[PDB]
Amino acid sequence: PNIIWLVLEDISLDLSVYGTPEVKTPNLDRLANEGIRYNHAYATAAVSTARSAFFTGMHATSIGAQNHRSHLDDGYYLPKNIKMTSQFMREAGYVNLLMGPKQKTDFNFSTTINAFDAQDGYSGGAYTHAPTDLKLLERPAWQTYIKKYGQPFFAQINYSETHRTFIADKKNPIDPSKVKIPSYYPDHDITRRDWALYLETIQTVDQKVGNLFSELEKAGVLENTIVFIFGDHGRAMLRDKQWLYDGGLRVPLIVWGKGIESNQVNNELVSLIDVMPTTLDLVGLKVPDYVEGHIFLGKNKQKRDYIYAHKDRTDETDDRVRAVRNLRFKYIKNFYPEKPYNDFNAYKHLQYPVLALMESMHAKKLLTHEQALFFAPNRPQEELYDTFNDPDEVNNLALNKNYEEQLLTMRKELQRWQKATNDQGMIDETPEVKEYWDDFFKKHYLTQMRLRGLSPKITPDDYLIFWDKFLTEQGK
């Protein structure tokens, strides 16, 4: 059986098959309907940390890759006991292909063995989405596989969508007045225009996914292939990506193809570190005891009580956050409660129009209570949400005595997990490394800003003048 991991960038449960208004995702909805659709799939982090984790079946904090980005060129290697997905598939006789327009691995470590056997051939900043005519199968990775090999393939296929910059879809343009907006962003034309383009970027990648499956079926390789389709983490919106709310962690996960019964919906807890062990099992390999991920499909399935996630340094922004989630409750511990949520991060300021919208509205005291939570000068050390009653996780139960028992249960589960995994995010990075990235990113802001002809100290209201023009040029 061939294996495909089709990885989408920065996307929440915003497909039409997941109940999202307005967006057209016919190809992905059809794959979901023809296989198993997972409603409770969670990444283990919300930015390199998500992909270092799911390529190894280990939380990035367990292998020292918690810091986005880190260990790029300092002689830090994967510990000998930790094998990459493709080392396992190689043993089983697979040839490993790196495909898709991206061509990146985003590991927070180096390797001494190749992650893939063939690829098309640093990925920071804003992405530009190429046209939907990309013939992925006529690129060097797939060309190499067909001409030099028998053997089955394991193929990771990375799409650039739905990363910023968002791209308009004029075949089926979206009405900003009709999209569904989480309660923690302002119901404002700036928000809805940015959000319409996010969903049009999902429509764009849906077309490309349709085009890929038409290429594969004309290859004759679909009959003996299982495809995992999943986001690496939630959508590129202000309180989603980087953070440990469901907007940042919950991702689409569809399992499709060889032997997979159709029209199934799964509501069990799945963490993205579960994809490697499940792939191993599907290919008839034993999962070594060290792997933290669970097998989630088939006779060897192993159910989860909880999923876990971390937030440590992101770009220049230093933080220390951990999450624990069962089916109902989200528990979040901020280890640095004195740091604001809105701690300076060039990426967010540079690419997110809604951040300027909310700093403008916050200064005028125009935010709702839910929207202003993110703009407090400090954080409570613990957050607890009843996601059944509060899916937008805006009502923190952690000081509510009515939930203290659940609070203590998950607090203690966090400690056990950290002890059991020897959480490396609990050790400080060196000053050298922190100051390097501070210098890397604080410069990134002032220059990309000056390039836009803007002052680094630009007021939110002036930035908003620029963003309204940015969005119009985008086409919304």
Site residues (vs ligand GAL, CB under 6 A): 47, 123-125, 315, 347
- Strand, coil or helix: what is 449? helix
Alpha-carbon distances of 292 from 60, 274, 326, 450, rounded to whole Å: 11, 8, 16, 45
Cα–Cα distance measured from residue 121 to residue 97, given in angstroms and rounded to the nearest whole number? 11
Contact between 240 and Ca ion per CB under 5 A: no
Interacting span for Ca ion (CB under 5 A) from 8-16, 186-194, 283-291, 341-349: 8-16
Structure tokens at 264: 């199934």
Contact between 442 and a copy of itself per CB under 8 A: yes
Position among 232, 240, 312, 393 found at the interface with Ca ion (CB under 5 A): 232
Q: How far is the CB of 209 from ligand GAL (least distance, A)?
A: 21
Among a copy of itself, ligand GAL, Ca ion, none, what does residue 447 contact (CB within 5–8 Å per kind)?
a copy of itself
Position among 208, 233, 349, 476 found at the interface with a copy of itself (CB under 8 A): 349
- Strand, coil or helix: what is 154? strand
Q: How far is the CB of 48 from ligand GAL (least distance, A)?
A: 8
Among ligand GAL, Ca ion, a copy of itself, none, what does residue 445 contact (CB within 5–8 Å per kind)?
a copy of itself
Q: How far is the CB of 327 from ligand GAL (least distance, A)?
A: 28
Position among 286, 456, 469, 472 found at the interface with a copy of itself (CB under 8 A): 456
E strand or H helix that includes residue 307: strand 307-311
Cα–Cα distance measured from residue 331 to residue 312, given in angstroms and rounded to the nearest whole number? 16
Q: How far is the CB of 199 from a copy of itself (least distance, A)?
A: 29
Where does 201-326 show beta strands of DSSP type E?
Answer: 225-231, 253-257, 264-266, 270-271, 307-311, 321-325
Q: φ and ψ at 329, to 5 degrees?
A: -105, 140
Pairing of strands 253-257, 264-266: unpaired
String marking each residue 217-256 x if it binds a copy of itself according to CB under 8 A: ----------------------------------------
Among a copy of itself, ligand GAL, Ca ion, none, what does residue 101 contact (CB within 5–8 Å per kind)?
none
Q: Position 45: which residue type?
A: A
Contact between 363 and a copy of itself per CB under 8 A: yes
Position among 7, 9, 102, 185 found at the interface with Ca ion (CB under 5 A): 9
Non-local CB neighbours of 100 within 8 Å, separated by 6+ positions: 7, 120, 136, 156, 157, 158, 159
Q: How far is the CB of 374 from a copy of itself (least distance, A)?
A: 15
Position among 161, 194, 292, 359 found at the interface with a copy of itself (CB under 8 A): 359
Among Ca ion, ligand GAL, a copy of itself, none, what does residue 149 contact (CB within 5–8 Å per kind)?
none
Strand partners, 110: 77
Q: How far is the CB of 263 from ligand GAL (least distance, A)?
A: 34
Cα–Cα distance measured from residue 203 to residue 193, given in angstroms and rounded to the nearest whole number? 15
Q: How far is the CB of 381 from a copy of itself (least distance, A)?
A: 21
Position among 343, 370, 404, 468 found at the interface with a copy of itself (CB under 8 A): 343
CA dihedral 66, 72, 75, 76 (to 10 degrees): 10
Residue 162: cis peptide before it, omega within 30 degrees of 0: yes
Position among 110, 151, 178, 344 found at the interface with a copy of itself (CB under 8 A): 344
Apex 147 CA angle, 146 and 149, nearest 5: 70
